[PDB]
C-alpha cells in the first residue's frame, strides 16, 4: 500500500454486520422512541409494552423500586410507573356516563 495508488488499489476497511436470530431471547434492538408525557388528558399510553387508553394523573401510591405496574382487585392496570422519571401515575378511564 502506497498513498500514490489509484482507486481500486487503495485500502478499504470493511465491516460485515451479520444479524443472526437464534430462538434465545433477543437482546439487540434499536433505540426505543419516547415522547413527552402529557397528563390530565385521555391519551393512549404505551409503557414498556403495556398499552391502553386513559387519563394519567399523579399518584400518592408509593411503589417498591422493582415494581412497575399496579392492579386493583379485578386485575386491571390502574397504576403505573413512568420509566423516564420514577413517578407513579394513576390511570383513570376516559370518562363515561349515561346521557
Amino acid at each position: 500500500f502506497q498513498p500514490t495508488y489509484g482507486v481500486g488499489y487503495q485500502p478499504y476497511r470493511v465491516v460485515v454486520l451479520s444479524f443472526e436470530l437464534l430462538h434465545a431471547p433477543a437482546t439487540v434492538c434499536g433505540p426505543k422512541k419516547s415522547t413527552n408525557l402529557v397528563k390530565n388528558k385521555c391519551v393512549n399510553f404505551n409503557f414498556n409494552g403495556l398499552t391502553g387508553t386513559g387519563v394519567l394523573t399523579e399518584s400518592n401510591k408509593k411503589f417498591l423500586p422493582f415494581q412497575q405496574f399496579g392492579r386493583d382487585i379485578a386485575d386491571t392496570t390502574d397504576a403505573v410507573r413512568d420509566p423516564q422519571t420514577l413517578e407513579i401515575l394513576d390511570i383513570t378511564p376516559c370518562s363515561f356516563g349515561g346521557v
Partner: antibody, heavy 117, light 108 residues
Framework: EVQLVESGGGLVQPGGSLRLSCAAS????????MSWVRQAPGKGLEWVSV???????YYADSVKGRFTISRHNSKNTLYLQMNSLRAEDTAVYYC???????????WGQGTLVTVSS | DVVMTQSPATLSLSPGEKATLSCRAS??????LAWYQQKPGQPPKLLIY???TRESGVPDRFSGSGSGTDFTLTISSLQAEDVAVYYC?????????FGGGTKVEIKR
C-alpha cells in the same frame, strides 16, 4: 521437470466444437492455477481463460459463454472445451501455470486451432 | 479495460549495447507487471515479475524498473540469442491484458 503438452488442435468448421487437452508433468493441476492464452497469427497474446486452485473458472469477454475451461484431477489433465467458434478464434493456444493468475512462469508448447470452412 | 502500449514497435541495436523497452498502462497498475520473451516458433518465457524481480534461470543482464503507469525493461548487454518479441503484461486489474510486443533486432 515441469512440462505442459497440448493436444486436440486442428481444423474445425465455424460453429463447430473442439476439446483441447493439456497434460502436465512436474506438478498437479488440481492444486494449481491454470490459464489458456491465445495468440493470433502475426498478432500479440490474448488471455482466454483461467481456472483457480479451488476450481473457480473465469473467461475473457470475447470468449465468455462459449468456452469452458475444466480439469480432471485423477490423471493430472487440463481441458478447454470450445463451442460455437467464430472466424476470429483461429489462434495458437497455450496452457500456462500461473502464480495465482498473476504471471505465467511455465508455458505449454501450444496447439493451433484453425476455424474455416 | 487497461490498454497496454509498448514502445518502440521494432528496436534495432548492435550487440553489446543497452536496450530500454518502455511499457505504458492506461491506468496505474502499481508494480503488478510481468515481462515475457517469445522466440520465433517457441512459447513465451517469463523474464521478470512484480516489475523488478527476476525469474530464476534468467541471466543478470535483464532488469526492470518503473511503477504506476511507466515501466522499463533494460537489457544491459545485447547478445545474439535475444532476437525475440518482448511483452509487458499487467495483472492488477481484473482482465489480464498483454502489450503489443516489441521485436528486438541485432545489428550485425
Amino acid at each position: 521437470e515441469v512440462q505442459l503438452v497440448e493436444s486436440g488442435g486442428g481444423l474445425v468448421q465455424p460453429g463447430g466444437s473442439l476439446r483441447l487437452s493439456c497434460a502436465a508433468s512436474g506438478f498437479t493441476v488440481s492444486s494449481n492455477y491454470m490459464s489458456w492464452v491465445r495468440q493470433a497469427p502475426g498478432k500479440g497474446l490474448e488471455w482466454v481463460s483461467v481456472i483457480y486452485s479451488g476450481g473457480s473458472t473465469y473467461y475473457a469477454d470475447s470468449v465468455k459463454g462459449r468456452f469452458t475451461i475444466s480439469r480432471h484431477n485423477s490423471k493430472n489433465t487440463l481441458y478447454l472445451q470450445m463451442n460455437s467458434l467464430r472466424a476470429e478464434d483461429t489462434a495458437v493456444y497455450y496452457c500456462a501455470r500461473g502464480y495465482g493468475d498473476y504471471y505465467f512462469d511455465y508455458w505449454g508448447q501450444g496447439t493451433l486451432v484453425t476455424v474455416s470452412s | 479495460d487497461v490498454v497496454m502500449t509498448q514502445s518502440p514497435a521494432t528496436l534495432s541495436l548492435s550487440p553489446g549495447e543497452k536496450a530500454t523497452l518502455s511499457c505504458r498502462a492506461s491506468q496505474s497498475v502499481s508494480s503488478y507487471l510481468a515481462w515475457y520473451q517469445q522466440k520465433p516458433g517457441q512459447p513465451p518465457k517469463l523474464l521478470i515479475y512484480w516489475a523488478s524481480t527476476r525469474e530464476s534461470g534468467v541471466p543478470d543482464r535483464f532488469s526492470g524498473s518503473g511503477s504506476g503507469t511507466d515501466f522499463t525493461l533494460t537489457i544491459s548487454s545485447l547478445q545474439a540469442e535475444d532476437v525475440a518479441v518482448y511483452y509487458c503484461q499487467q495483472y492488477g486489474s481484473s482482465p489480464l491484458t498483454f502489450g503489443g510486443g516489441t521485436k528486438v533486432e541485432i545489428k550485425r
